[model samples]
Target: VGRLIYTAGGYFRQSLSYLEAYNPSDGTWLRLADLQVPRSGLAGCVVGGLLYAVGGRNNSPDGNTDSSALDCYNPMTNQWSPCAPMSVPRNRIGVGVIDGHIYAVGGSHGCIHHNSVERYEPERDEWHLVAPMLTRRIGVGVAVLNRLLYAVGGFDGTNRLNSAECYYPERNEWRMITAMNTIRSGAGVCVLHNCIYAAGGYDGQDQLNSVERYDVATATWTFVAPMKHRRSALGITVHQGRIYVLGGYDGHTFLDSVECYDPDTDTWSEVTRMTSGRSGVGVAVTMEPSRK
Candidate 1:
Protein backbone atom coordinates (compact mmCIF):
# COMPACT_ATOMS: atom_id res chain seq x y z
CA VAL A 1 0.00 0.00 0.00
CA GLY A 2 1.08 3.57 -0.73
CA ARG A 3 1.03 6.12 2.14
CA LEU A 4 0.41 9.84 2.10
CA ILE A 5 1.99 11.81 4.95
CA TYR A 6 1.46 15.37 6.25
CA THR A 7 3.78 17.04 8.72
CA ALA A 8 4.15 20.17 10.89
CA GLY A 9 2.46 23.55 10.19
CA GLY A 10 0.68 26.23 12.18
CA TYR A 11 -1.96 28.93 12.37
CA PHE A 12 -2.50 32.23 14.24
CA ARG A 13 -1.50 31.14 17.70
CA GLN A 14 1.35 28.60 17.46
CA SER A 15 3.28 26.14 15.37
CA LEU A 16 2.37 22.42 15.36
CA SER A 17 4.36 19.23 15.85
CA TYR A 18 1.91 16.65 14.61
CA LEU A 19 2.54 14.15 11.81
CA GLU A 20 -0.33 12.32 10.20
CA ALA A 21 -0.69 9.55 7.63
CA TYR A 22 -3.50 8.93 5.17
CA ASN A 23 -4.73 5.59 3.97
CA PRO A 24 -6.33 6.21 0.56
CA SER A 25 -7.87 2.76 0.37
CA ASP A 26 -9.78 3.35 3.59
CA GLY A 27 -10.02 7.14 3.29
CA THR A 28 -8.72 7.63 6.81
CA TRP A 29 -5.98 9.53 8.60
CA LEU A 30 -3.92 8.10 11.46
CA ARG A 31 -2.05 10.47 13.72
CA LEU A 32 1.60 9.57 14.06
CA ALA A 33 4.50 10.58 16.27
CA ASP A 34 5.09 14.32 16.74
CA LEU A 35 8.18 16.26 15.80
CA GLN A 36 10.70 17.11 18.51
CA VAL A 37 9.96 20.78 17.91
CA PRO A 38 6.79 22.44 16.76
CA ARG A 39 7.50 24.30 13.53
CA SER A 40 6.29 25.81 10.27
CA GLY A 41 7.91 26.54 6.88
CA LEU A 42 9.96 23.35 7.06
CA ALA A 43 10.75 21.14 4.03
CA GLY A 44 10.33 17.35 3.92
CA CYS A 45 10.95 14.41 1.53
CA VAL A 46 11.53 10.69 1.65
CA VAL A 47 14.90 9.07 1.06
CA GLY A 48 16.03 5.50 1.66
CA GLY A 49 12.62 4.47 3.02
CA LEU A 50 12.56 7.15 5.71
CA LEU A 51 10.82 10.55 5.88
CA TYR A 52 13.14 13.48 6.61
CA ALA A 53 12.08 16.90 7.95
CA VAL A 54 14.43 19.81 7.56
CA GLY A 55 14.78 23.50 8.59
CA GLY A 56 12.02 25.96 9.58
CA ARG A 57 11.08 28.28 12.45
CA ASN A 58 10.12 26.81 15.79
CA ASN A 59 6.99 28.79 16.67
CA SER A 60 8.98 31.95 17.18
CA PRO A 61 7.77 35.52 16.65
CA ASP A 62 10.94 36.67 14.92
CA GLY A 63 11.26 35.30 11.40
CA ASN A 64 15.00 35.15 11.75
CA THR A 65 14.58 32.64 14.55
CA ASP A 66 14.67 29.84 11.97
CA SER A 67 15.88 26.45 13.14
CA SER A 68 18.68 24.21 11.91
CA ALA A 69 17.12 21.05 13.35
CA LEU A 70 16.71 17.93 11.24
CA ASP A 71 14.55 14.91 12.09
CA CYS A 72 13.63 11.63 10.45
CA TYR A 73 10.60 9.36 10.72
CA ASN A 74 10.63 5.64 10.14
CA PRO A 75 7.13 4.37 9.31
CA MET A 76 8.07 0.78 9.82
CA THR A 77 8.60 1.44 13.50
CA ASN A 78 6.42 4.55 13.91
CA GLN A 79 9.29 6.42 15.51
CA TRP A 80 11.18 9.68 14.93
CA SER A 81 14.90 10.24 15.41
CA PRO A 82 17.09 13.31 15.28
CA CYS A 83 19.38 13.54 12.30
CA ALA A 84 22.36 15.71 11.47
CA PRO A 85 21.25 19.34 11.28
CA MET A 86 21.85 21.69 8.39
CA SER A 87 24.91 23.92 8.57
CA VAL A 88 22.63 26.92 8.13
CA PRO A 89 19.40 27.69 9.92
CA ARG A 90 16.47 28.44 7.58
CA ASN A 91 12.73 28.61 7.05
CA ARG A 92 10.63 28.14 3.91
CA ILE A 93 13.20 25.75 2.51
CA GLY A 94 12.49 23.50 -0.50
CA VAL A 95 13.46 19.81 -0.34
CA GLY A 96 13.84 17.14 -3.04
CA VAL A 97 15.04 13.53 -2.91
CA ILE A 98 17.00 11.79 -5.65
CA ASP A 99 19.29 8.78 -5.86
CA GLY A 100 18.94 8.02 -2.12
CA HIS A 101 20.05 11.49 -1.11
CA ILE A 102 18.06 14.53 0.12
CA TYR A 103 18.70 18.07 -1.12
CA ALA A 104 17.69 21.16 0.88
CA VAL A 105 17.48 24.28 -1.27
CA GLY A 106 17.06 28.05 -0.90
CA GLY A 107 15.23 29.66 2.03
CA SER A 108 15.70 32.44 4.58
CA HIS A 109 17.94 32.30 7.61
CA GLY A 110 16.06 35.01 9.48
CA CYS A 111 16.26 38.29 7.52
CA ILE A 112 18.60 37.01 4.84
CA HIS A 113 17.34 34.91 1.95
CA HIS A 114 19.73 32.24 0.65
CA ASN A 115 20.84 30.78 -2.66
CA SER A 116 22.98 28.15 -0.93
CA VAL A 117 22.19 24.47 -1.46
CA GLU A 118 22.95 21.48 0.75
CA ARG A 119 22.55 17.70 0.53
CA TYR A 120 22.26 14.92 3.11
CA GLU A 121 23.58 11.39 2.89
CA PRO A 122 21.83 9.23 5.52
CA GLU A 123 24.42 6.52 5.45
CA ARG A 124 26.97 9.06 6.64
CA ASP A 125 24.48 11.29 8.53
CA GLU A 126 26.16 14.41 7.21
CA TRP A 127 25.30 17.51 5.13
CA HIS A 128 27.55 19.36 2.72
CA LEU A 129 27.04 22.59 0.79
CA VAL A 130 26.98 22.41 -2.98
CA ALA A 131 26.62 24.91 -5.84
CA PRO A 132 24.24 27.72 -4.88
CA MET A 133 21.13 28.72 -6.81
CA LEU A 134 21.22 31.43 -9.52
CA THR A 135 18.79 33.49 -7.41
CA ARG A 136 18.33 33.81 -3.69
CA ARG A 137 14.92 32.45 -2.72
CA ILE A 138 12.65 31.37 0.16
CA GLY A 139 9.19 29.75 0.07
CA VAL A 140 10.08 28.25 -3.30
CA GLY A 141 8.65 25.07 -4.84
CA VAL A 142 11.04 22.24 -5.71
CA ALA A 143 10.53 18.97 -7.58
CA VAL A 144 12.62 16.30 -9.27
CA LEU A 145 12.00 15.65 -12.95
CA ASN A 146 13.83 13.09 -15.08
CA ARG A 147 16.55 13.00 -12.38
CA LEU A 148 17.05 16.79 -12.56
CA LEU A 149 16.10 19.07 -9.64
CA TYR A 150 13.99 22.16 -10.48
CA ALA A 151 13.50 25.15 -8.19
CA VAL A 152 10.48 27.33 -8.88
CA GLY A 153 9.11 30.77 -7.82
CA GLY A 154 9.68 32.42 -4.41
CA PHE A 155 10.67 35.59 -2.56
CA ASP A 156 14.18 36.59 -3.60
CA GLY A 157 14.70 38.83 -0.50
CA THR A 158 13.69 41.94 -2.51
CA ASN A 159 10.81 40.65 -4.61
CA ARG A 160 8.25 37.90 -5.12
CA LEU A 161 9.66 36.09 -8.16
CA ASN A 162 8.64 34.20 -11.27
CA SER A 163 12.16 32.97 -11.97
CA ALA A 164 12.99 29.25 -12.15
CA GLU A 165 16.23 27.28 -12.16
CA CYS A 166 17.50 23.72 -12.41
CA TYR A 167 20.38 21.86 -10.74
CA TYR A 168 22.49 19.16 -12.38
CA PRO A 169 24.19 17.14 -9.64
CA GLU A 170 26.71 15.50 -11.93
CA ARG A 171 27.87 18.94 -13.08
CA ASN A 172 27.53 20.47 -9.57
CA GLU A 173 25.86 23.57 -11.07
CA TRP A 174 22.65 25.56 -11.35
CA ARG A 175 21.38 27.49 -14.39
CA MET A 176 18.48 29.92 -14.89
CA ILE A 177 15.58 28.85 -17.07
CA THR A 178 12.42 30.55 -18.37
CA ALA A 179 10.46 32.27 -15.61
CA MET A 180 6.86 31.51 -14.71
CA ASN A 181 4.09 33.71 -16.14
CA THR A 182 3.03 34.79 -12.65
CA ILE A 183 5.29 35.77 -9.81
CA ARG A 184 4.55 33.79 -6.64
CA SER A 185 5.80 32.84 -3.19
CA GLY A 186 4.88 29.74 -1.20
CA ALA A 187 3.43 28.05 -4.28
CA GLY A 188 2.77 24.29 -4.26
CA VAL A 189 4.70 22.46 -7.01
CA CYS A 190 5.04 18.84 -8.18
CA VAL A 191 6.05 17.01 -11.35
CA LEU A 192 3.58 15.03 -13.40
CA HIS A 193 3.95 13.51 -16.84
CA ASN A 194 7.42 15.07 -17.12
CA CYS A 195 6.15 18.64 -16.59
CA ILE A 196 6.34 20.86 -13.50
CA TYR A 197 3.03 22.23 -12.21
CA ALA A 198 3.08 25.25 -9.88
CA ALA A 199 -0.22 25.82 -8.13
CA GLY A 200 -1.80 28.51 -5.92
CA GLY A 201 0.51 30.90 -4.06
CA TYR A 202 0.80 34.44 -2.79
CA ASP A 203 1.78 37.09 -5.26
CA GLY A 204 3.10 40.33 -3.74
CA GLN A 205 -0.33 41.98 -3.44
CA ASP A 206 -2.66 39.06 -2.88
CA GLN A 207 -3.16 35.35 -2.39
CA LEU A 208 -3.47 33.63 -5.80
CA ASN A 209 -5.62 30.90 -7.25
CA SER A 210 -3.66 30.84 -10.49
CA VAL A 211 -1.84 27.74 -11.72
CA GLU A 212 0.86 27.19 -14.30
CA ARG A 213 3.04 24.47 -15.82
CA TYR A 214 6.65 24.41 -16.98
CA ASP A 215 7.71 22.24 -19.88
CA VAL A 216 11.33 21.12 -19.53
CA ALA A 217 11.77 20.42 -23.22
CA THR A 218 10.74 23.95 -24.20
CA ALA A 219 12.07 25.67 -21.09
CA THR A 220 8.78 27.59 -20.84
CA TRP A 221 5.86 28.10 -18.48
CA THR A 222 2.16 28.14 -19.45
CA PHE A 223 -0.94 29.11 -17.49
CA VAL A 224 -3.38 26.36 -16.61
CA ALA A 225 -6.93 26.35 -15.19
CA PRO A 226 -7.07 28.20 -11.90
CA MET A 227 -7.80 26.31 -8.70
CA LYS A 228 -11.17 26.66 -6.94
CA HIS A 229 -9.67 28.66 -4.08
CA ARG A 230 -6.86 31.08 -3.53
CA ARG A 231 -4.11 29.72 -1.27
CA SER A 232 -0.60 30.13 0.06
CA ALA A 233 1.58 27.76 2.06
CA LEU A 234 -0.37 24.82 0.66
CA GLY A 235 0.88 21.21 0.72
CA ILE A 236 1.14 19.34 -2.60
CA THR A 237 2.13 15.79 -3.62
CA VAL A 238 1.76 13.42 -6.54
CA HIS A 239 0.26 9.96 -5.99
CA GLN A 240 -0.57 7.33 -8.57
CA GLY A 241 -0.39 9.87 -11.44
CA ARG A 242 -2.61 12.54 -9.81
CA ILE A 243 -1.58 15.78 -8.08
CA TYR A 244 -3.24 16.54 -4.74
CA VAL A 245 -3.21 19.99 -3.10
CA LEU A 246 -4.12 20.26 0.58
CA GLY A 247 -4.82 22.92 3.26
CA GLY A 248 -3.54 26.47 3.13
CA TYR A 249 -4.33 30.04 4.10
CA ASP A 250 -6.03 32.47 1.69
CA GLY A 251 -4.91 35.70 3.40
CA HIS A 252 -8.17 35.62 5.31
CA THR A 253 -8.89 32.14 6.64
CA PHE A 254 -7.16 28.80 7.20
CA LEU A 255 -8.47 26.11 4.83
CA ASP A 256 -9.14 22.40 5.16
CA SER A 257 -10.20 21.99 1.54
CA VAL A 258 -8.42 19.59 -0.81
CA GLU A 259 -8.23 19.47 -4.60
CA CYS A 260 -6.82 17.03 -7.14
CA TYR A 261 -5.77 17.47 -10.74
CA ASP A 262 -5.79 14.90 -13.47
CA PRO A 263 -2.99 15.71 -15.92
CA ASP A 264 -4.30 13.47 -18.67
CA THR A 265 -7.55 15.47 -18.79
CA ASP A 266 -5.89 18.79 -17.89
CA THR A 267 -8.57 19.43 -15.29
CA TRP A 268 -8.99 19.75 -11.54
CA SER A 269 -11.69 18.55 -9.12
CA GLU A 270 -12.50 18.91 -5.44
CA VAL A 271 -11.67 16.00 -3.15
CA THR A 272 -12.06 15.12 0.54
CA ARG A 273 -11.30 17.87 3.00
CA MET A 274 -8.73 17.52 5.75
CA THR A 275 -10.08 17.01 9.26
CA SER A 276 -8.52 20.23 10.40
CA GLY A 277 -7.15 23.20 8.48
CA ARG A 278 -3.44 24.02 8.35
CA SER A 279 -0.82 25.90 6.37
CA GLY A 280 2.89 25.42 5.72
CA VAL A 281 2.68 21.67 6.17
CA GLY A 282 5.07 19.16 4.54
CA VAL A 283 3.59 16.46 2.28
CA ALA A 284 4.99 13.26 0.78
CA VAL A 285 3.78 10.05 -0.84
CA THR A 286 5.51 6.68 -0.42
CA MET A 287 4.81 3.73 -2.66
CA GLU A 288 5.52 0.25 -1.34
CA PRO A 289 7.98 -1.87 -3.22
CA SER A 290 6.34 -4.28 -5.62
CA ARG A 291 5.97 -7.83 -4.36
CA LYS A 292 7.63 -10.62 -6.24
Candidate 2:
Protein backbone atom coordinates (compact mmCIF):
# COMPACT_ATOMS: atom_id res chain seq x y z
CA VAL A 1 0.00 0.00 0.00
CA GLY A 2 3.03 2.22 0.44
CA ARG A 3 5.79 3.14 -1.97
CA LEU A 4 8.38 0.49 -1.14
CA ILE A 5 9.45 -2.94 -2.40
CA TYR A 6 10.93 -5.40 0.11
CA THR A 7 12.92 -8.50 -0.88
CA ALA A 8 13.06 -11.12 1.84
CA GLY A 9 15.47 -13.91 0.86
CA GLY A 10 17.14 -15.25 -2.29
CA TYR A 11 20.31 -16.42 -4.06
CA PHE A 12 23.14 -14.33 -5.47
CA ARG A 13 25.41 -17.33 -6.02
CA GLN A 14 24.47 -19.36 -2.96
CA SER A 15 21.51 -18.98 -0.56
CA LEU A 16 21.02 -15.53 1.03
CA SER A 17 19.32 -14.23 4.18
CA TYR A 18 19.73 -10.70 2.89
CA LEU A 19 16.71 -8.36 3.05
CA GLU A 20 16.58 -5.17 1.00
CA ALA A 21 14.14 -2.46 -0.04
CA TYR A 22 13.72 -0.33 -3.17
CA ASN A 23 11.98 2.98 -3.70
CA PRO A 24 11.20 3.53 -7.38
CA SER A 25 10.14 7.14 -6.88
CA ASP A 26 13.71 8.29 -6.38
CA GLY A 27 15.46 5.13 -7.56
CA THR A 28 17.07 4.17 -4.25
CA TRP A 29 17.71 0.93 -2.43
CA LEU A 30 18.08 0.28 1.29
CA ARG A 31 19.26 -2.74 3.31
CA LEU A 32 16.87 -3.90 5.97
CA ALA A 33 17.02 -6.40 8.87
CA ASP A 34 17.96 -9.93 7.86
CA LEU A 35 16.07 -13.21 8.32
CA GLN A 36 17.62 -14.96 11.33
CA VAL A 37 17.64 -18.21 9.38
CA PRO A 38 19.34 -18.17 6.00
CA ARG A 39 17.40 -19.76 3.17
CA SER A 40 16.37 -19.09 -0.43
CA GLY A 41 13.33 -19.17 -2.76
CA LEU A 42 10.90 -18.27 0.04
CA ALA A 43 7.47 -16.81 -0.81
CA GLY A 44 6.21 -13.56 0.76
CA CYS A 45 2.99 -11.48 0.90
CA VAL A 46 1.66 -8.41 2.70
CA VAL A 47 -1.23 -8.59 5.17
CA GLY A 48 -2.51 -5.78 7.36
CA GLY A 49 0.79 -3.89 7.63
CA LEU A 50 3.44 -6.57 7.81
CA LEU A 51 5.34 -8.33 5.03
CA TYR A 52 5.44 -12.11 5.64
CA ALA A 53 8.14 -14.45 4.31
CA VAL A 54 7.62 -18.19 4.38
CA GLY A 55 8.83 -21.59 3.12
CA GLY A 56 12.56 -21.43 2.46
CA ARG A 57 14.96 -24.25 1.65
CA ASN A 58 18.67 -24.08 2.52
CA ASN A 59 20.25 -25.14 -0.76
CA SER A 60 18.87 -24.53 -4.22
CA PRO A 61 19.76 -27.90 -5.81
CA ASP A 62 19.43 -30.28 -2.83
CA GLY A 63 16.21 -28.69 -1.48
CA ASN A 64 15.53 -27.54 2.07
CA THR A 65 15.11 -29.92 4.94
CA ASP A 66 13.77 -26.92 6.88
CA SER A 67 10.84 -25.86 4.75
CA SER A 68 7.98 -25.00 7.12
CA ALA A 69 9.63 -21.80 8.39
CA LEU A 70 7.58 -18.58 8.46
CA ASP A 71 8.71 -15.04 9.29
CA CYS A 72 7.50 -11.43 9.08
CA TYR A 73 8.97 -7.92 8.90
CA ASN A 74 7.63 -4.70 10.37
CA PRO A 75 9.06 -1.63 8.60
CA MET A 76 8.14 0.55 11.55
CA THR A 77 10.49 -1.56 13.67
CA ASN A 78 12.81 -2.81 10.94
CA GLN A 79 13.19 -6.37 12.21
CA TRP A 80 12.28 -9.90 11.10
CA SER A 81 10.55 -12.11 13.65
CA PRO A 82 9.24 -15.66 13.45
CA CYS A 83 5.58 -16.37 12.88
CA ALA A 84 3.19 -19.34 13.06
CA PRO A 85 4.49 -22.00 10.66
CA MET A 86 2.61 -23.75 7.89
CA SER A 87 1.62 -27.32 8.83
CA VAL A 88 3.28 -28.65 5.68
CA PRO A 89 6.83 -28.11 4.47
CA ARG A 90 6.63 -26.43 1.10
CA ASN A 91 9.40 -25.33 -1.22
CA ARG A 92 8.73 -22.76 -3.94
CA ILE A 93 5.23 -22.15 -2.59
CA GLY A 94 2.93 -19.52 -4.13
CA VAL A 95 1.47 -16.85 -1.79
CA GLY A 96 -1.32 -14.25 -1.90
CA VAL A 97 -3.36 -12.11 0.49
CA ILE A 98 -7.11 -12.47 0.17
CA ASP A 99 -9.71 -10.80 2.40
CA GLY A 100 -6.98 -10.10 4.97
CA HIS A 101 -5.82 -13.74 5.02
CA ILE A 102 -2.51 -15.07 3.67
CA TYR A 103 -3.05 -18.03 1.35
CA ALA A 104 -0.19 -20.49 0.99
CA VAL A 105 -0.73 -22.46 -2.18
CA GLY A 106 0.98 -25.39 -3.92
CA GLY A 107 4.75 -25.98 -3.55
CA SER A 108 7.03 -29.02 -3.45
CA HIS A 109 8.43 -30.85 -0.44
CA GLY A 110 11.64 -31.76 -2.28
CA CYS A 111 10.23 -35.21 -3.08
CA ILE A 112 6.52 -34.79 -3.82
CA HIS A 113 4.87 -31.81 -5.42
CA HIS A 114 1.48 -31.03 -3.84
CA ASN A 115 -2.05 -29.96 -4.70
CA SER A 116 -2.90 -29.08 -1.09
CA VAL A 117 -3.33 -25.50 0.17
CA GLU A 118 -3.72 -23.48 3.37
CA ARG A 119 -4.13 -19.94 4.73
CA TYR A 120 -2.85 -18.00 7.73
CA GLU A 121 -4.93 -15.77 9.96
CA PRO A 122 -2.57 -13.19 11.42
CA GLU A 123 -5.02 -12.09 14.08
CA ARG A 124 -5.26 -15.63 15.45
CA ASP A 125 -1.63 -16.41 14.62
CA GLU A 126 -2.64 -19.76 13.14
CA TRP A 127 -2.76 -21.70 9.88
CA HIS A 128 -5.68 -23.68 8.44
CA LEU A 129 -5.83 -26.04 5.48
CA VAL A 130 -8.11 -24.95 2.65
CA ALA A 131 -9.49 -26.97 -0.26
CA PRO A 132 -6.73 -28.51 -2.37
CA MET A 133 -6.04 -27.71 -6.04
CA LEU A 134 -6.90 -29.96 -9.01
CA THR A 135 -3.28 -30.48 -10.06
CA ARG A 136 -0.12 -31.06 -8.06
CA ARG A 137 2.30 -28.26 -8.78
CA ILE A 138 5.40 -26.51 -7.47
CA GLY A 139 6.99 -23.19 -8.44
CA VAL A 140 3.49 -21.81 -8.91
CA GLY A 141 2.56 -18.10 -9.20
CA VAL A 142 -0.48 -17.04 -7.17
CA ALA A 143 -2.50 -13.78 -7.00
CA VAL A 144 -5.82 -12.39 -5.84
CA LEU A 145 -8.23 -11.04 -8.43
CA ASN A 146 -11.97 -10.36 -8.18
CA ARG A 147 -11.69 -11.66 -4.62
CA LEU A 148 -10.65 -15.09 -6.00
CA LEU A 149 -7.28 -16.73 -5.40
CA TYR A 150 -5.76 -17.65 -8.77
CA ALA A 151 -2.97 -20.22 -9.03
CA VAL A 152 -1.04 -19.88 -12.27
CA GLY A 153 1.24 -22.20 -14.28
CA GLY A 154 3.76 -24.24 -12.35
CA PHE A 155 5.83 -27.40 -12.55
CA ASP A 156 4.41 -30.75 -11.63
CA GLY A 157 6.82 -33.49 -10.57
CA THR A 158 7.26 -34.78 -14.11
CA ASN A 159 6.84 -31.60 -16.18
CA ARG A 160 5.95 -27.91 -16.26
CA LEU A 161 2.31 -26.89 -16.88
CA ASN A 162 0.36 -24.10 -18.51
CA SER A 163 -2.59 -25.05 -16.29
CA ALA A 164 -4.19 -22.37 -14.07
CA GLU A 165 -7.12 -22.22 -11.63
CA CYS A 166 -9.01 -19.87 -9.31
CA TYR A 167 -10.22 -20.58 -5.76
CA TYR A 168 -13.11 -19.24 -3.73
CA PRO A 169 -12.15 -18.64 -0.09
CA GLU A 170 -15.81 -18.67 0.97
CA ARG A 171 -16.57 -21.88 -0.91
CA ASN A 172 -13.19 -23.51 -0.21
CA GLU A 173 -13.07 -24.76 -3.82
CA TRP A 174 -11.11 -24.23 -7.03
CA ARG A 175 -12.21 -24.07 -10.67
CA MET A 176 -10.03 -24.20 -13.76
CA ILE A 177 -9.38 -21.08 -15.83
CA THR A 178 -8.33 -20.86 -19.44
CA ALA A 179 -4.65 -21.75 -19.65
CA MET A 180 -1.85 -19.44 -20.82
CA ASN A 181 -0.32 -19.68 -24.32
CA THR A 182 3.08 -20.72 -22.92
CA ILE A 183 4.27 -22.96 -20.07
CA ARG A 184 5.73 -20.99 -17.14
CA SER A 185 6.67 -22.32 -13.75
CA GLY A 186 8.03 -19.78 -11.24
CA ALA A 187 6.79 -16.95 -13.42
CA GLY A 188 6.04 -13.58 -11.81
CA VAL A 189 2.26 -13.06 -11.43
CA CYS A 190 0.42 -9.89 -10.35
CA VAL A 191 -2.78 -7.94 -10.95
CA LEU A 192 -2.34 -4.73 -12.90
CA HIS A 193 -4.92 -2.76 -14.92
CA ASN A 194 -7.59 -5.30 -13.93
CA CYS A 195 -5.61 -8.16 -15.51
CA ILE A 196 -3.51 -10.91 -13.94
CA TYR A 197 -0.12 -10.96 -15.66
CA ALA A 198 2.00 -14.13 -15.80
CA ALA A 199 5.49 -12.99 -16.63
CA GLY A 200 8.89 -14.68 -17.29
CA GLY A 201 9.85 -18.12 -15.99
CA TYR A 202 11.41 -21.46 -16.89
CA ASP A 203 9.36 -23.55 -19.31
CA GLY A 204 10.98 -26.88 -18.35
CA GLN A 205 13.10 -26.72 -21.48
CA ASP A 206 14.18 -23.06 -21.26
CA GLN A 207 14.03 -19.77 -19.37
CA LEU A 208 11.40 -17.53 -21.02
CA ASN A 209 10.92 -13.80 -21.60
CA SER A 210 7.30 -14.22 -22.70
CA VAL A 211 4.46 -12.45 -20.86
CA GLU A 212 0.68 -12.89 -20.86
CA ARG A 213 -2.35 -11.56 -18.96
CA TYR A 214 -5.76 -13.02 -18.04
CA ASP A 215 -9.16 -11.40 -17.86
CA VAL A 216 -11.99 -12.91 -15.79
CA ALA A 217 -14.84 -11.35 -17.75
CA THR A 218 -13.52 -12.53 -21.12
CA ALA A 219 -11.99 -15.75 -19.72
CA THR A 220 -9.13 -15.06 -22.06
CA TRP A 221 -5.33 -14.78 -22.10
CA THR A 222 -3.30 -12.49 -24.36
CA PHE A 223 0.40 -11.73 -24.80
CA VAL A 224 2.21 -8.57 -23.74
CA ALA A 225 5.54 -7.60 -25.20
CA PRO A 226 8.28 -9.75 -23.67
CA MET A 227 11.06 -8.36 -21.44
CA LYS A 228 14.27 -8.03 -23.37
CA HIS A 229 15.89 -10.65 -21.10
CA ARG A 230 14.56 -14.10 -20.18
CA ARG A 231 14.10 -14.78 -16.47
CA SER A 232 12.93 -17.55 -14.17
CA ALA A 233 11.93 -17.13 -10.52
CA LEU A 234 11.92 -13.36 -10.89
CA GLY A 235 10.38 -11.00 -8.30
CA ILE A 236 7.54 -8.73 -9.48
CA THR A 237 5.33 -5.97 -8.02
CA VAL A 238 3.30 -2.97 -9.18
CA HIS A 239 4.57 0.47 -8.14
CA GLN A 240 3.45 3.94 -9.17
CA GLY A 241 2.02 3.35 -12.70
CA ARG A 242 4.21 0.47 -13.90
CA ILE A 243 4.95 -3.21 -13.31
CA TYR A 244 8.49 -3.92 -12.09
CA VAL A 245 10.26 -7.27 -12.67
CA LEU A 246 13.44 -7.73 -10.69
CA GLY A 247 16.40 -10.09 -10.42
CA GLY A 248 15.99 -13.67 -11.66
CA TYR A 249 18.06 -16.13 -13.66
CA ASP A 250 18.44 -15.27 -17.36
CA GLY A 251 19.91 -18.69 -18.33
CA HIS A 252 23.46 -17.35 -18.63
CA THR A 253 23.46 -15.46 -15.26
CA PHE A 254 21.34 -14.09 -12.42
CA LEU A 255 20.19 -10.45 -12.87
CA ASP A 256 20.24 -7.43 -10.58
CA SER A 257 18.57 -5.34 -13.23
CA VAL A 258 15.04 -3.96 -12.83
CA GLU A 259 12.65 -3.60 -15.75
CA CYS A 260 9.53 -1.45 -15.82
CA TYR A 261 6.51 -2.18 -18.02
CA ASP A 262 3.77 0.26 -18.82
CA PRO A 263 0.44 -0.86 -20.34
CA ASP A 264 1.89 0.53 -23.58
CA THR A 265 3.33 -3.00 -24.14
CA ASP A 266 6.51 -1.94 -25.84
CA THR A 267 7.70 0.69 -23.35
CA TRP A 268 10.28 -1.01 -21.06
CA SER A 269 12.84 0.89 -18.96
CA GLU A 270 15.55 -1.07 -17.15
CA VAL A 271 17.82 -0.29 -14.19
CA THR A 272 20.60 -2.15 -12.38
CA ARG A 273 20.37 -2.55 -8.59
CA MET A 274 22.76 -4.02 -5.99
CA THR A 275 26.16 -5.47 -6.80
CA SER A 276 25.09 -8.99 -7.84
CA GLY A 277 22.09 -10.32 -9.73
CA ARG A 278 19.45 -12.09 -7.63
CA SER A 279 17.40 -15.13 -8.58
CA GLY A 280 14.60 -16.75 -6.56
CA VAL A 281 14.29 -13.57 -4.54
CA GLY A 282 11.15 -13.32 -2.38
CA VAL A 283 9.67 -9.86 -3.11
CA ALA A 284 6.68 -8.04 -1.52
CA VAL A 285 5.44 -4.42 -1.20
CA THR A 286 4.80 -2.69 2.12
CA MET A 287 4.35 0.62 3.92
CA GLU A 288 3.69 1.39 7.58
CA PRO A 289 0.15 0.51 8.54
CA SER A 290 -1.91 3.51 9.56
CA ARG A 291 -2.81 3.69 13.20
CA LYS A 292 -6.42 3.82 14.27
Best prediction by lDDT: 2
Model 2 scores a C-alpha lDDT of 0.84
Write one digit per residue (lDDT tens) for candidate 2, span 95-142.
888889888888888688989999898999999999999999788999
lDDT of 1 by residue, 60-169 (tens): 55443688888988777777899999989878889888788888989888788999999989999999999999999899999999888999999998899988999999
lDDT of 1 at 257: 83
- Top candidate by TM-score: 2
Q: Which stretches of candidate 1 lie over 4 Å from their true place?
A: 60-64, 287-292
TM-score of each: 0.93, 0.94
Relative to the true structure, how large is the alpha-carbon lDDT of every model?
Answer: 0.84, 0.84
Error of 2 at 80 (Å): 1.2
| TM-score of candidate 2 to 2 decimals | 0.94
